[PDB]
Scaffold this motif. Structure first.
Motif, mmCIF file in Angstrom:
data_model
loop_
_atom_site.group_PDB
_atom_site.id
_atom_site.type_symbol
_atom_site.label_atom_id
_atom_site.label_comp_id
_atom_site.label_asym_id
_atom_site.label_seq_id
_atom_site.Cartn_x
_atom_site.Cartn_y
_atom_site.Cartn_z
ATOM 1 N N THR D 328 0.811 -1.210 0.000
ATOM 2 C CA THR D 328 0.000 0.000 0.000
ATOM 3 C C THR D 328 0.847 1.263 0.000
ATOM 4 N N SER D 329 2.133 1.157 0.336
ATOM 5 C CA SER D 329 3.006 2.323 0.276
ATOM 6 C C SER D 329 3.194 2.843 -1.145
ATOM 7 N N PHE D 330 2.849 2.054 -2.161
ATOM 8 C CA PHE D 330 3.083 2.438 -3.549
ATOM 9 C C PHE D 330 1.768 2.674 -4.275
ATOM 10 N N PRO D 331 1.448 3.916 -4.649
ATOM 11 C CA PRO D 331 0.178 4.169 -5.342
ATOM 12 C C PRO D 331 0.249 4.027 -6.852
ATOM 13 N N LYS D 332 1.434 4.049 -7.450
ATOM 14 C CA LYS D 332 1.546 3.995 -8.898
ATOM 15 C C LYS D 332 1.974 2.607 -9.359
ATOM 16 N N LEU D 333 1.655 2.304 -10.619
ATOM 17 C CA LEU D 333 1.871 0.959 -11.143
ATOM 18 C C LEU D 333 3.354 0.623 -11.238
ATOM 19 N N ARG D 334 4.154 1.540 -11.782
ATOM 20 C CA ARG D 334 5.580 1.272 -11.941
ATOM 21 C C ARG D 334 6.246 1.038 -10.593
ATOM 22 N N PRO D 665 -6.124 3.566 -8.325
ATOM 23 C CA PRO D 665 -4.933 3.182 -7.558
ATOM 24 C C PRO D 665 -4.672 1.688 -7.667
ATOM 25 N N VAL D 666 -3.391 1.324 -7.655
ATOM 26 C CA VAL D 666 -3.013 -0.045 -7.983
ATOM 27 C C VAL D 666 -3.084 -0.954 -6.760
ATOM 28 N N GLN D 667 -2.641 -0.476 -5.596
ATOM 29 C CA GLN D 667 -2.595 -1.342 -4.421
ATOM 30 C C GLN D 667 -3.993 -1.736 -3.960
ATOM 31 N N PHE D 668 -4.935 -0.794 -3.980
ATOM 32 C CA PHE D 668 -6.293 -1.119 -3.566
ATOM 33 C C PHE D 668 -6.965 -2.037 -4.575
ATOM 34 N N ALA D 669 -6.669 -1.850 -5.862
ATOM 35 C CA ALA D 669 -7.161 -2.785 -6.867
ATOM 36 C C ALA D 669 -6.601 -4.178 -6.629
ATOM 37 N N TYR D 670 -5.322 -4.263 -6.264
ATOM 38 C CA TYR D 670 -4.715 -5.550 -5.941
ATOM 39 C C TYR D 670 -5.410 -6.203 -4.754
ATOM 40 N N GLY D 671 -5.675 -5.428 -3.704
ATOM 41 C CA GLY D 671 -6.379 -5.977 -2.555
ATOM 42 C C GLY D 671 -7.771 -6.464 -2.909
ATOM 43 N N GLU D 686 -12.842 -29.623 -6.911
ATOM 44 C CA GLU D 686 -12.457 -30.442 -8.051
ATOM 45 C C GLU D 686 -12.469 -29.676 -9.364
ATOM 46 N N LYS D 687 -12.868 -28.407 -9.352
ATOM 47 C CA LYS D 687 -12.910 -27.603 -10.563
ATOM 48 C C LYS D 687 -12.342 -26.224 -10.273
ATOM 49 N N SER D 688 -11.785 -25.602 -11.307
ATOM 50 C CA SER D 688 -11.287 -24.245 -11.184
ATOM 51 C C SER D 688 -12.448 -23.254 -11.199
ATOM 52 N N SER D 689 -12.202 -22.069 -10.647
ATOM 53 C CA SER D 689 -13.225 -21.041 -10.549
ATOM 54 C C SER D 689 -12.698 -19.737 -11.120
ATOM 55 N N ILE D 690 -13.556 -19.034 -11.855
ATOM 56 C CA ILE D 690 -13.226 -17.737 -12.428
ATOM 57 C C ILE D 690 -14.302 -16.749 -12.008
ATOM 58 N N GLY D 691 -13.887 -15.643 -11.399
ATOM 59 C CA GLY D 691 -14.790 -14.576 -11.009
ATOM 60 C C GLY D 691 -14.465 -13.307 -11.780
ATOM 61 N N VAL D 692 -15.507 -12.683 -12.320
ATOM 62 C CA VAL D 692 -15.380 -11.468 -13.113
ATOM 63 C C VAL D 692 -16.243 -10.393 -12.475
ATOM 64 N N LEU D 693 -15.679 -9.199 -12.319
ATOM 65 C CA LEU D 693 -16.392 -8.096 -11.685
ATOM 66 C C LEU D 693 -15.845 -6.792 -12.240
ATOM 67 N N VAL D 694 -16.670 -6.076 -12.996
ATOM 68 C CA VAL D 694 -16.255 -4.862 -13.692
ATOM 69 C C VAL D 694 -16.609 -3.651 -12.845
ATOM 70 N N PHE D 695 -15.640 -2.758 -12.668
ATOM 71 C CA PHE D 695 -15.831 -1.493 -11.964
ATOM 72 C C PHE D 695 -15.942 -0.398 -13.019
ATOM 73 N N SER D 696 -17.163 -0.176 -13.505
ATOM 74 C CA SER D 696 -17.374 0.803 -14.565
ATOM 75 C C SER D 696 -17.174 2.222 -14.047
ATOM 76 N N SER D 697 -17.975 2.625 -13.069
ATOM 77 C CA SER D 697 -17.916 3.960 -12.494
ATOM 78 C C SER D 697 -17.889 3.889 -10.975
ATOM 79 N N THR D 698 -17.029 3.032 -10.434
ATOM 80 C CA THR D 698 -16.900 2.889 -8.992
ATOM 81 C C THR D 698 -15.519 2.333 -8.685
ATOM 82 N N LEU D 699 -14.845 2.941 -7.714
ATOM 83 C CA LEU D 699 -13.530 2.467 -7.318
ATOM 84 C C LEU D 699 -13.637 1.111 -6.628
ATOM 85 N N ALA D 700 -12.520 0.393 -6.613
ATOM 86 C CA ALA D 700 -12.465 -0.976 -6.128
ATOM 87 C C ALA D 700 -11.649 -1.058 -4.848
ATOM 88 N N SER D 701 -12.176 -1.786 -3.868
ATOM 89 C CA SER D 701 -11.454 -2.054 -2.634
ATOM 90 C C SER D 701 -11.955 -3.367 -2.057
#
Lengths: 117, 122, 294, 829
Positions: D328-334, D665-671, D686-701
């Motif tokens: 969380t100390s790093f807000p930028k992607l690079r 922000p990258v760290q909160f998206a990672y969390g 016994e099976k793999s799982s895939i979850g998809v969740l789009v943040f169109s106009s709302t930040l992610a945490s």
């Protein structure tokens, strides 16, 4: 270019009274749909007989199509109602035009002559 | 939910095949229920709708038992709930007609959730 | 003295300003923020403020920060267990020469647990000597806002948190008697939903020598001012960004890293200096178990 | 002449084509000759240096993933490349690399960049082939003893060679001899000794410089036969016996069901011919069945033998006790990418270097830690072995902790060192007991002392606190630079994402294809603009600055891995399982890249997409998977990657996928994506799982994700399954004609038609989801059934509704899930 509806130059309004000569029977779209009368009743607006605007528009369009086909001119054509490949006017190099499409519109172009009830 | 149950009971009553018919047709036609809804919309009066459905039952155009159930349900209802009930009836009747569900399948289903369980299984 | 807060609404908490956004950090409400709100209400009512006021950080009702001897039976679950009267069953031998590495033996059974010091834990049930617990999870939302004079020029965002009834311990004063509802959060004049303070039964807890559960992020000493010495400290490091008045000039934003809340410290002696409870720290206390909320 | 490998946990036996291995023997010998020649070139007519370099290269043969990245790069970008460079050039220099400074260490590693890396990467394709073959061949052809592959047994053999060796006995010679012996056992179990002799002869005929040394090695192996009395063969035999560990179990002997070959192939004496003859005698099917039965009995069998003597080696666990604050100390992607790379480097390579220096000085510049002592060390967790010559294990832990604290006293990075006894003289402990010891010696982390300091909360403003020191340093953009963040930015200015962009990755296949992001990305930028600033946009896919496009985050993790490794018969089995998992993950990623490359579309488009995907990789390998592919290709990429996860690695994966705006922000998206991945776990497993969740106009945490899942998703009547089977998504994509990468790229490169096409495909589903948002569950289901009823034949709506409804047991129906899956691609363009 027959799609000049963006710019309105002139508007004319025709107001008159339609009097039937023979026994006028309303369209009666209320097919087997009784409301307050015997058997199949003619349509009416609050117990007032009303000539549908759609019926008049269809009759006028049929008459205009007949006239245009009687013209027998290459520049003026009429396309089938069910056809979706028709266009109103073609600006290919003088062009072709559709008189009923110009007047009462098509899928590609809205009408220019509005008819009320 | 409860209106859904009422509507599905009405629909399964209406899905009874019309006897002495050349084609396996339901007793109640789609045009009939559509006319019911349209008449209720235009004529905002529950008593007039009751008279309409009673006349239709007397015309042998809708099922007598379905008409009885409709009259019992809408006997003392307002207009706002009546239009919702008619809309739900239209929905469930259309679902039954499109899904080609015969009466023997639904038979006497009482809860809409059981009906959708059957539809999901089938 | 105990207080009650019928929040049941969306409020903010410790924010981490990012570019121009703000994010929730602490799932709980820190004492400093509360104290600031309660003192701001006093200032609004009268204006005469007092620094001798201390209030413990509020936590969701029936919840508490986790300590080391309250681990989760699952490495990835949220089900926590501990022995009844554990601190009495623990400690005790601290007077004797008992090896601490032997003292902190959590392998009561096979597949011994892993603890997470300083997490919100909710009491669940008796289940013989090992009491059932559950980690607390709250509700959060995102509230973004636009900037106009009719026409947008900038953008902002916020993150609110939903809380149930809140409880905290304060100082016996007429301040709580004369204050009923407190605006709390980053935006006090914009974004509050509903706030209130309820006075309840007086609380008499004793602070003396022995193993003590540090509810607030305690600190052993600062600027050489020794507050207490501890035989063994069990917990985690924390970072403090708060407020304290030293009478004369300055006295805001002193940043000094401290122990994480819920850390277990075996203090054997204290000092009589300026207590840091009004600074929102050093709210330790002797408890038999987490059932001290009762 | 039949050999079959037992796979787990699917319990399948696969037999190895003899023609394939006999063909790859030539490539193995060629690689050995190449490595010998390279060692001779680097030693400059030296014998000791050449010996060390050749030992390191031969170790690299058996550990490709830990020394060669998934995609070879001409630029040092991954910790594995740095590790390879260090283990190569450590013998080159006569002076130890200073470990007190991390910046200087990285600078030195970058400076030691020669064409040797390119020469190795040229044959890296054949090296990967050989590594796969070694991973897919069992160590022992005997049924019931075939559950461990060859790579794990070989690594344990090298480890035991380094450990059990003592006195004036040569170790490098012993290492090479053991490795050649195991290779010969691979190529010809009956005459492995003669095959090793032939290998040595061919190598000697290959290498010109190393003649006397290799001839001496061959003579020592030959004259000191197995029946003859000799120290080298004694040590090698004891090491192999300890590695196998299964012959000390009497269960296989007491389990006499067939009663035909237990007397001859099994017993005190071993004869490969008898085992092979029996194998035909009863046939493989029966062989596989009996092997399964024996393995089940052994897994149901428990033995406990403890050597009263000392432990010849220790295992050291390196992990990070707390990464959330650092991330969380790093807000930028690079900055975040450089931080992840630095964390992995510190956990694995820095620890290895410190231990190597300590060991090298402990002996007095006599021996050195073998390069293959590094077992784990990707993703933060690292398992490193040590010899029981440093002394007290707690002393070693304290030394490592002190060195780490001195080095990283300013980065805020503190490493927790966990050391447990690895193996005894005549017994090697199973992984479960070792992990038990590790977890037992964990209280010491929780003991701390009081310290007074000041660290700026995050990296912002000028606090007051104690005024003795200067304030927060000013920044070129103003005042947003804390000292720690300033130092990290200084470190990342030269190396990091920019290094990846300025590299040229090559895919070694039937046709070697190179990728140059400096020449492949179509982001037209002025020469006065900084690519690192627009790194997030570049990874997102902004072809121009005036572009709107979301970017997706993909995080994957294995299912129930901890208990799976706990229920492991032997340490070799654990090593084999870990190696298979890591190599299979890398293979899946590489195959997905190859599939993208073969799309029957313009090479520019696929090259650009591959470049963006490669740039959007944080860390891959093992249980830790992180990916930042563009949203327009993310979900199909995940589906293609994880369709064959069980086939490749055998581990089911829980995967969470989100799609936030580039400015997020990258760290909160990672969390948040980590929380989603954890929540999207199949309870059966016994099976793999895939979850998809789009943040169109709302930040992610993380908190927002938890709240939304607790509110909308439920267990009785829900539209958000979250835990979605991969095959369901595959069927959905096939129904939507989006599985094919060519169609995806055609939509991607041309948003003018792409937006229209995707909106046409998604409008009906969007309408259904809208009505779902209007009313409750019952009403929504009624409307869905009505829509299904009023749908003409051969239409798409009926197919979509049938896929949604049919196959769902409870009143749980993936509707929000499918809508978000479509919405990811919709917002991707």
């Amino acid at each position: 270019s027959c799609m000049d509806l963006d710019v309105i130059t002139t508007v004319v309004k025709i107001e008159g009274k339609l009097r039937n000569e023979t026994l006028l029977r309303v369209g009666k779209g209320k097919t087997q749909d009784f409301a307050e009368a015997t058997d199949n009743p003619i349509i009416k607006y609050r117990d007032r007989p009303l000539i549908p605007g759609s019926s008049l528009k269809g009759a006028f369009r049929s008459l205009v199509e007949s006239y245009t086909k009687s013209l027998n001119d290459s520049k003026y054509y009429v396309c089938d109602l069910d056809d979706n490949s028709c266009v109103s006017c073609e600006e290919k190099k003088e062009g072709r035009y559709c008189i009923p499409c110009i007047l009462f519109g098509f899928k590609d172009l809205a009408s220019r002559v509005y008819i009320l009830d | 939910q409860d209106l859904l149950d009422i509507a599905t009971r009405i629909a399964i009553s209406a899905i009874k095949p019309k006897p002495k018919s050349n084609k396996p047709e339901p007793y109640v036609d789609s045009s009939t229920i559509n006319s019911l809804l349209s008449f209720l919309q235009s004529r905002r009066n529950v008593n007039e709708l009751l008279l309409y459905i009673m006349r239709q039952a007397g015309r042998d155009e809708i099922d007598e038992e379905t008409g009885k159930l409709l009259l019992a349900s809408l006997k003392d209802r307002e207009l706002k709930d009546a239009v919702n009930l008619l809309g739900y009836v239209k929905w469930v009747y259309d679902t039954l007609t499109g899904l080609k569900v015969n009466y023997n399948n639904v038979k006497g289903v009482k809860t809409f959730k059981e009906l959708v369980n059957i539809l999901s299984k089938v | 003295i105990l207080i009650k807060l019928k929040v049941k609404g969306y409020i903010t908490t410790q924010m981490r300003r990012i570019r121009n956004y703000y994010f929730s950090i602490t799932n709980y409400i820190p004492s400093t923020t509360l104290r600031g709100a309660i003192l701001a209400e006093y200032y609004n009512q009268t204006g005469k403020i007092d620094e001798n006021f201390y209030v413990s950080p509020a936590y969701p009702i029936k919840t508490a920060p986790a300590h080391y001897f309250s681990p989760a039976k699952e490495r990835k679950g949220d089900e926590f267990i501990e022995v009844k009267r554990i601190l009495e069953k623990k400690e005790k031998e601290f007077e004797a020469n008992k090896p601490i590495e032997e003292i902190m033996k959590l392998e009561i059974d096979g597949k011994h647990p892993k603890p997470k010091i300083g997490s919100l834990i909710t009491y669940e049930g008796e289940t013989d000597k090992e009491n059932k617990y559950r980690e607390f999870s709250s509700k959060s939302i995102i509230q973004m806002h636009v900037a106009i004079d009719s026409y947008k020029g900038m953008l902002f965002a916020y993150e609110y948190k939903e809380f149930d009834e809140m409880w905290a311990i304060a100082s016996d004063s007429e301040v709580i008697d004369t204050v009923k509802r407190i605006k709390i959060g980053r935006g006090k004049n914009r974004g509050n939903k509903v706030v209130d303070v309820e006075k309840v039964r007086e609380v008499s807890l004793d602070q003396s020598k022995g193993l003590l559960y540090c509810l607030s992020p305690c600190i052993g000493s600062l600027f050489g001012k020794t507050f207490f010495k501890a035989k063994y400290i069990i917990g985690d490091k924390s970072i403090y960004s708060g407020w304290f008045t030293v009478d004369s000039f300055s006295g805001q934003k002193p940043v000094f890293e401290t122990l994480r809340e819920g850390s277990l410290v075996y203090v054997e002696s204290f000092s009589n200096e300026k207590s840091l409870m009004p600074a929102g720290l050093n709210f330790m206390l002797r408890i038999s178990d987490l059932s001290s909320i009762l | 002449m039949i050999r079959g490998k037992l796979l787990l946990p699917e319990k399948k036996v696969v037999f190895i084509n003899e023609s394939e291995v006999q063909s790859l023997r030539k490539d193995v010998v060629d690689a050995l000759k190449v490595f010998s020649s390279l060692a001779c070139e680097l030693a400059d007519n030296n014998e000791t240096k050449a010996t060390n370099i050749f030992a390191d290269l031969i170790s690299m043969i058996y550990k490709l993933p830990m020394l060669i990245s998934y995609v070879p790069s001409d630029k040092l970008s991954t910790p594995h490349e740095y590790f390879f460079a260090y283990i190569v050039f450590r013998h080159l220099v006569e002076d130890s690399m200073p470990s007190n400074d991390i910046a200087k260490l990285l600078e030195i590693l970058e400076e030691k960049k020669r064409d040797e890396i390119k020469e190795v990467l040229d044959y890296a394709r054949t090296l990967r082939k050989i590594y796969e073959k070694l991973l897919y061949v069992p160590a022992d052809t005997r049924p019931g003893y075939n559950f461990t592959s060859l790579a794990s047994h070989l690594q344990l053999s090298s480890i035991l060679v380094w450990l059990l060796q003592k006195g004036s006995v040569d170790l490098n010679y012993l290492r090479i001899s053991a490795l050649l012996h195991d290779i010969g056992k691979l190529f010809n179990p009956t005459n492995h000794v003669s095959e090793s002799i032939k290998i040595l002869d061919e190598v000697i005929e290959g290498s010109e410089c190393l003649k006397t040394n290799l001839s001496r090695v061959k003579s020592l192996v030959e004259q000191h036969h197995a029946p003859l009395e000799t120290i080298l063969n004694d040590a090698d035999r004891l090491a192999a016996s300890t590695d196998r560990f299964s012959e000390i179990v009497k269960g296989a002997l007491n389990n006499t069901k067939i009663g035909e070959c237990y007397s001859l192939c099994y017993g005190r004496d071993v004869r490969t011919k008898e085992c092979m003859e029996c194998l035909e005698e009863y046939g493989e099917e029966t062989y596989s069945e009996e092997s399964k039965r024996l393995y089940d009995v052994i897994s149901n069998s428990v033995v406990s033998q403890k050597v009263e003597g000392n432990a010849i080696g220790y295992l050291v666990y390196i992990d990070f006790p707390g990464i959330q604050r650092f991330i969380t100390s790093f807000p930028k992607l690079r900055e975040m990418s450089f931080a992840s790379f630095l964390v992995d480097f510190v956990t694995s390579i820095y620890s290895f270097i410190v231990l190597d220096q300590a060991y090298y000085e402990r002996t007095g510049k006599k021996s050195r830690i073998p390069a293959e002592a590094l077992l784990s060390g990707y993703g933060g967790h690292s398992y490193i072995i040590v010899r029981s010559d440093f002394g007290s294990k707690d002393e070693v832990k304290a030394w490592l902790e002190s060195v780490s604290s001195s080095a990283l006293s300013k980065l805020g990075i503190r490493l927790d060192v966990k050391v447990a006894d690895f193996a005894y003289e005549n017994y090697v402990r199973n992984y479960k007991e070792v992990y038990e010891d590790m977890m037992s010696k964990s209280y010491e982390r929780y003991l701390i002392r009081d310290e007074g300091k000041v660290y700026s909360y995050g990296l912002h403003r000028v606090c007051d606190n104690c005024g003795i020191r200067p304030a927060v340093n000013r920044s070129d953009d103003g005042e947003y630079l804390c000292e720690t963040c300033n130092l990290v930015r200084d470190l990342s200015k030269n190396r990091g994402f920019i290094a990846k962009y300025k590299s040229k990755y090559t895919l070694y296949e039937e046709q070697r294809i190179e990728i140059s992001p400096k020449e492949d990305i179509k982001f037209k930028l002025d020469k006065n603009q900084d690519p690192t600033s627009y790194a997030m946009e570049i990874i997102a896919g902004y072809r121009t600055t005036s572009d709107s496009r979301y970017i997706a985050l993909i995080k994957a993790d294995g299912n129930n891995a901890g208990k799976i490794f706990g229920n492991t018969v032997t340490f070799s089995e654990y090593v084999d399982k870990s190696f298979r998992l890591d190599f299979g993950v890398k293979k899946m990623f590489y195959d997905t890249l190859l599939d993208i490359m073969r799309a029957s579309s313009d090479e520019s488009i696929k090259k650009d997409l591959v470049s963006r995907i490669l740039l959007g990789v944080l860390y891959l390998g093992g249980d830790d998977i992180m990916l930042l592919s563009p949203s327009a290709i993310a979900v199909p990429f995940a589906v293609k990657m994880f369709k064959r996860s069980l086939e490749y690695t055998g581990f089911t994966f829980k995967v969470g996928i989100i799609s936030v705006k580039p400015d997020h922000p990258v760290q909160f998206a990672y969390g948040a994506v980590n929380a989603l991945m954890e929540e999207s776990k199949i309870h059966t497993g016994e099976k793999s799982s895939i979850g998809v969740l789009v943040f169109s106009s709302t930040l992610a945490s993380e908190g927002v994700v938890k709240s939304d899942l607790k509110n909308y998703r439920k267990e009785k009547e829900s539209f958000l399954v979250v835990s979605n089977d991969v095959d369901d998504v595959e069927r959905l994509l096939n129904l939507m004609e989006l599985d094919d990468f060519g169609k995806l790229m055609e939509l991607y490169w041309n948003p003018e038609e792409g937006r229209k096409v995707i909106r046409d495909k998604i409008r009906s589903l969007e309408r259904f989801v809208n009505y779902a948002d209007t009313h409750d569950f019952y009403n929504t289901l009624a409307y869905l059934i009505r829509s299904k009823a009023k749908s003409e034949e051969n239409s798409l709506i009926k197919r979509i509704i049938d896929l949604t409804i049919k196959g769902r047991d409870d009143f749980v129906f993936p509707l929000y899930d499918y809508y978000f899956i479509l919405k990811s691609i919709r917002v991707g363009i």
